[PDB]
Write a protein that binds this DNA or RNA. Structure first.
Lengths: 100, 80, 95, 107, 95, 103, 86, 103
DNA sequence: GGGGGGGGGGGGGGGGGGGGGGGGGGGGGGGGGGGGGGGGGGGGGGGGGGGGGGGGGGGGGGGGGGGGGGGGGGGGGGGGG
DNA sequence: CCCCCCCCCCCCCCCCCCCCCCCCCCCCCCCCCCCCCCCCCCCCCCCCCCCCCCCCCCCCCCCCCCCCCCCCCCCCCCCCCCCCCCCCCCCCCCCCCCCCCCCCCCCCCCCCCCCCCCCCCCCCCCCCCCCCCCCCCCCCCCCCCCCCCCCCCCCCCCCCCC
């Protein structure tokens, strides 16, 4: 029936624009809250969390991953690609001194 | 379903877009998850150490803020 | 309930002289307060390190001044110093 | 009464700043008479500098209240503040930007 | 006056315990002296803030311990904490 | 009269460390009895860890005195010490390494 | 009571010295433009460090830049140095 | 030929020989006097009439060579990531953008 | 080039969470004046270290040439977002 | 009926045999200078010992707020078709590394004088402390107002496909 398809890369550019325009969080909340609580459980049991604490952790993480994706993209582009790959994330963390 | 997998491709894809990224390899999703796990371990470990020292059982925004600052990742907007 | 000091009302006053008809959201005020606390800490810290390097015990406006030159980027420092000398002067000359 | 702050022509709390400096001290150390004044004028100045740029960022958006996004726009947009403020601004997002080589279709 | 404190005699003692027939060049001792000062400034610093955040004015062995857990990497922390604990306990066992 | 170091069973100077803490105090600041003791133990322990490794290296090079080069092989060589000690060590050079794709 | 004007001393960081530094850093092949780039990067680095060191010197009302001044300046910028102080 | 082709190492062979050599030593690689003039010249352009303890200058040299060497390791990773073995200005620039510096 | 289908933009509108304006309080800052104490600046003073000037010689540097190597470009394919 | 039986194509794969002059390299060896190493006091400096506060802990009291749940709402994962993109190979020219030659500037060794800086000693302007007076800012409670932001309608422009 209705045959309409955008070319690979057109929606993607639209997404970049939409998401750089906005400021909301992008990881769904409960899933992130669960991850935080599980990681914490290995350092101390029966822990509770202020709500503002989980939120600060989410704001810090997303700012960190977004900035890591910017350097990662620079590494892919340096290698003449437009697709980020694990070796680009690795090169970027290696130079930042984070190593892993 | 493991918790770390609650951080889904779609969410990882949105973070990359805000990061100006155009095309994503399929292996990127597991790698991003490992990276986030390490970042969160480093920060929670420091937050919880501030909690225990204060003799509480509730990790507070300030414990997270002082943990982030200690790591050179200062955050504004949550106290301190 | 114990008092939490904040720089909010002073940030709001400075806001009014700068854009008399503009407001500021709660989340934005929280950020400004974090910013003011952060800058005062980096400055008092450098100034007391300066004092210690020089085997001195007093934090004078001269340490605050060198600390500003060490912490702020060129222009920002130029004006800031200028704003500092100007407040001290106006204050020295008074009753 | 007058008050240290009013006496110095500043909006920032000279008395309070002074008290705070007596606590960031070397065991038995002292604080100069004017040190608080100077510090208060430095904080007042930077606060004004950011509000001024954040305030322009919001007017050029035809809105009345400065938000975190406005603060992020003003800070990353000025070379000197960007350099001075490395903190993450919660809720600010990033400056829009797409690498020339990703924007395309080319010809 | 002119006399400057150094940690070199103490570093030599420790070197003799771990490597009885090994010496240390003056350049090397200089580095060890900086290393020790650096680590101490970092621990006292963390202990102060730590105390501050908790509205405490006293820096105890408890603040030093937490300072140590924040500053050292996993395994170094455990062994250091156990040596810290051991020396406090012994010290107080005499008073 | 037993020194506080001797009383604690340490080589690092407790009295001096106590003195230095009292002067980095912060106004009405107090320094507990045992804070300096715990501090001297952490310091003596880290120092012991670095010398143990530098000394092993000066030995695999048939030599008697530890140099900055030995301190640097020992520190870059240990994951945790490397992580803890970011300072530049004058005269230590680097750890030999060549990327496989260059050979 | 005399002189000598310092000019263009950045060319004193010669092509062989830059190649030695790159060898220690594990570099095998060097393009022709690397040398003027390295000089520019060294000039900036030294400017930033010398600027802070001289600020400590003046603050202390001395005319002599001391190893300590350099060491505190390297520390402020996150580049701690061991072997003179830290 | 007569005394035949005078021996010649292939391109790259002496370069590898060089990395092995400098990587195992610790001396300062930039000549001292020229580096001292560069220091005096930059200092002078900030404040005239300054003197220097000779160790102040040695501290700046150690810091500078440690900074350049680590920058060439990062630059070398950017070249190899790009499938080259030759470092280029764009490799140095990439390393500094990611490190968060600039100029 | 045109259609065909979309997204996007612009201006306008409305409710509601957010913000504000008010009054009221009170332990706690803030400021004052007076007294006492203390950090420090000058002023020699003496010693220590830093440019500077001299001379001698060999390693370091520069320039040149040649060839091998390596980077860039182009094309194509299967494969992967 | 696509896969199956051809079909030839690059791709490797032993195979031949030394090299071979540096390249370390490793052992040895020996002056040398700096690193200890006693001496030599000696200001420092850390320990003790009362004498006097004192801050912190700890139980108790208080009470916002965290977790949890239910009801209601929404993002995710998906399999699939398509096309571009990353990769791989080949080709080619330019560029940079190796080597040679000649040169010289950095180094090394000495001293030396003069700046300048630290150290002490003297003096005193300046800060703290204190008590009293006072104002006062954060909080509670309140509670009217409002800027925003999602939504809507209508229009324009862009992209993809034909």
């Amino acid at each position: 029936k209705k045959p309409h398809r955008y070319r690979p890369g057109t929606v993607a550019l639209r997404e970049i624009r939409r998401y750089q325009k906005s400021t909301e969080l992008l990881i769904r909340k409960l899933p992130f809250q669960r991850l935080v609580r599980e990681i914490a459980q290995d350092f101390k049991t029966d822990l509770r969390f202020q709500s503002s604490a989980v939120m600060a952790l989410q704001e810090a993480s997303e700012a960190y991953l977004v900035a890591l994706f910017e350097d990662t993209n620079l590494c892919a582009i340096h290698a003449k690609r437009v697709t980020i790959m694990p070796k680009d994330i690795q090169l970027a963390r290696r130079i930042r001194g984070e190593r892993a | 379903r493991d918790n770390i997998q609650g951080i889904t491709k779609p969410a990882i894809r949105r973070l990359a877009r805000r990061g100006g990224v155009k095309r994503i390899s399929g292996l990127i999703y597991e790698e991003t998850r490992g990276v986030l796990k390490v970042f969160l371990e480093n920060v929670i470990r420091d937050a919880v150490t501030y909690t225990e020292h204060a003799k509480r059982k509730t990790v507070t925004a300030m414990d997270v803020v002082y943990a982030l600052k200690r790591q050179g990742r200062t955050l504004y907007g949550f106290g301190g | 309930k114990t008092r939490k000091e904040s720089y909010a009302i002073y940030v709001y006053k400075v806001l009014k002289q700068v854009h008399p008809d503009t407001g500021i959201s709660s989340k934005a005020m929280s950020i400004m307060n974090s910013f003011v606390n952060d800058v005062f800490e980096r400055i008092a810290g450098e100034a007391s390190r300066l004092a210690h390097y020089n085997k001195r015990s007093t934090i004078t406006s001269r340490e605050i001044q060198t600390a500003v030159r060490l912490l702020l980027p060129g222009e920002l420092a130029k004006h800031a110093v200028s704003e500092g000398t100007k407040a001290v002067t106006k204050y020295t000359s008074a009753k | 009464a007058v008050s240290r702050s009013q006496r110095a022509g500043l909006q920032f709390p000279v008395g309070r700043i002074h008290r705070h400096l007596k606590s960031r001290t070397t065991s038995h150390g002292r604080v100069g008479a004017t040190a608080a004044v100077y510090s208060a004028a430095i904080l007042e100045y930077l606060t004004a500098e950011v509000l001024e740029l954040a305030g322009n960022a919001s007017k050029d958006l035809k809105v009345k209240r400065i938000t975190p996004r406005h603060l992020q726009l003003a800070i990353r947009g000025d070379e000197e503040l960007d350099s001075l403020i490395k903190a993450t601004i919660a809720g600010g997002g990033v400056i829009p930007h797409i690498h020339k080589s990703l924007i395309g279709k080319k010809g």
